[PDB]
Amino acid sequence: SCAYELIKSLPAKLEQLAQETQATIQTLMIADPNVNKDLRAFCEFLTVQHQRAYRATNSLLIKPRVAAALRGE
């Protein structure tokens, strides 16, 4: 294929993971207040993780020479 599309699709892949685990963590019946707090904090870690990636890939792919190189142009 091409490297441009691999990298550009990276943020959505991380977003998918974040939702999978958040959704699954939600199907839990946890009574412990601290465990709930830990998992909540981990869930926010995954959201932040996605946004850093989104920002990093966005800043990368606007560089015309970079996009051209990744497209085999």
Add this chain to the structure above:
Amino acid sequence: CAYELIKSLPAKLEQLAQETQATIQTLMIADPNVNKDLRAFCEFLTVQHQRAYRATNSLLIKPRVAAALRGEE
């Protein structure tokens, strides 16, 4: 089964890093400036899975948390 899903996160991110860093290297780019940018992105990708690595392991080592994420044991 939420325990395995969380436990496998860092490894999935490492796969993404590896695949990207690899297909990038299959591109023989000359512009040293573009290559510096891409190397900065690969660095970002390896630091990315190391953060997930620390996060997941820091969470799963807590007994109350592991027990909860498993079938409660």
